[PDB]
């Protein structure tokens with residue numbers, strides 16, 4: 800059911816916020832600070848920013864009809880990171896480590 804599915808999504812996002820993954824998850828906790836040095840072009844490249852705190856707020860406001868809608872925002876968050884940064888950037892390796900956590904849980908729910 801969609802209700803149980805969404806409860807599982809909340810559980811996946813709670814693990815993504817956990818201390819276990821904090822060493823690589825922290826760039827994704829809050830919206831990208833577009834005022835920070837080096838990020839002056841973020842809004843020109845990334846048309847739909849997304850982060851974990853925004854996804855948590857959307858789950859709380861019932862903005863996802865189902866797990867597929869939630870999963871689309873988590874994957875949008877990673878895709879933004881892959882699109883914006885050079886492929887060898889430290890933040891892309893962190894996105895991949897976090898996406899490993901997400902994909903494994905999302906597949907097994």
Ligand SMILES: COc1cc(=O)n(C)nc1-c1ccccc1Oc1ccccc1
Nearest residue numbers: 826827831832835879880883884889890
């Ligand atoms: C290029 O900076 C980013 C691109 C991006 O896609 N995200 C999601 N966040 C950032 C970012 C923003 C502010 C501070 C640090 C940041 O990440 C870094 C992580 C490791 C090394 C350097 C930067």
